[PDB]
Design a protein around this ligand. Structure first.
Ligand code: NAI
Ligand code: 2YC
Ligand code: MG
Ligand code: NA
Length: 259
């Protein structure tokens, strides 16, 4: 399974700053503006309780600290509980948390206790990175390539289909590809018969998944995938506009979706 390491989260404030500038360049909107477009919501210092969780692989170094910073960055009044797990959840609620933010190895959720809304990181991440890609100001095309049609990728593709884009899809697992084509109506992408895209969305845990043949100059590559979907070489060569950030954008999508 594809879990963060502590090194992925180093200087999360800078990673967020850089991602937010890239998002502004690409779409004319900052991350808050994207979330406002997606969900119509804005932050008003809602209290967010962040609960460390020890199950499975356990507490990931820098994870709760990064969420603490991300939440503050978007204007939430956040805190991290002293205790983990159920004791931590009790602490969070007792200290007045309106939104609970917590994750085990399989599920990262946000639960707004005031209105009952609950978000899962996987669809929220897919949706927001697909939204960003979709809003590329200089795209001059409704064609989009989605690489990776799993838990993050499938909802991203679904979002793009709802937005009336012409969605091409590829997954290395043939069964996943088939699932997407027959449930979403996407066009299966044929790697042996590529075409160029100005808009690309990638959601795999693998490097170098985007072939050169698919790139156009200045195309947007919006990717929650870790590590990076393209080499530095190809990024520089085609002046690719990369939106890639390990936790904060997806977390913002969760939070603004439950407001
Ligand atoms: N940046 C962020 O905020 C977040 C990042 N992620 C990351 O997103 C990635 C995807 O997560 P999930 O969708 O949950 O994983 P998943 O395992 O559900 O789906 C990944 C898909 O990519 C496909 N794939 C793998 N190698 C490929 C290749 N070379 N070419 C085409 N397809 C390939 C797999 O067949 C699989 O269907 C992971 O690396 C995960 O860590 C996940 C959540 C939030
Ligand atoms: C990109 C992230 C967000 C969702 N999946 C990836 C992930 O690493 N999930 C596992 C998070 C586990 C956190 C850990 N239980 C903790 O509380 O420190
Ligand atoms: Mg992110
Ligand atoms: Na990747």
């Amino acid at each position: 399974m594809a879990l963060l390491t502590p090194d992925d989260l180093i200087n999360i404030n800078m990673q967020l700053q850089k991602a937010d500038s890239a998002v502004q360049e690409v779409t004319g909107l900052d991350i808050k503006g994207i979330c406002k477009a997606l969900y119509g919501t804005f932050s008003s210092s809602e209290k967010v309780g962040i609960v460390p969780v020890t199950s499975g692989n356990g507490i990931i170094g820098n994870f709760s600290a990064s969420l603490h910073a991300i939440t503050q960055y978007f204007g939430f009044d956040s805190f991290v509980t002293d205790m983990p797990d159920v004791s931590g959840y009790y602490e969070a609620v007792q200290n007045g948390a309106e939104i609970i933010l917590m994750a085990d190895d399989r599920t990262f959720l946000a639960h707004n206790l005031k209105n009952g809304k609950m978000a899962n990181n996987q669809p929220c991440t897919g949706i927001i990175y697909a939204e960003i890609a979709s809003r590329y100001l200089k795209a001059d095309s409704k064609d989009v390539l989605v690489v990776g049609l799993g838990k993050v990728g499938f909802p991203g593709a679904e979002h793009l289909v709802q937005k009336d884009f012409r969605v091409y899809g590829y997954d290395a697992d043939e069964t996943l590809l088939e699932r997407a084509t027959s449930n979403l109506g996407i066009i299966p992408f044929d790697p042996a018969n590529p075409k160029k895209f100005s808009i690309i969305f990638e959601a795999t845990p693998c490097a170098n998944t985007i072939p050169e043949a698919v790139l156009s100059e200045n195309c947007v590559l919006s990717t929650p995938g870790i590590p990076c979907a393209i080499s530095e070489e190809l990024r520089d060569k085609y002046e690719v506009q990369l939106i890639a950030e390990p936790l904060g954008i997806g977390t913002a999508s969760m939070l603004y979706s439950v407001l």
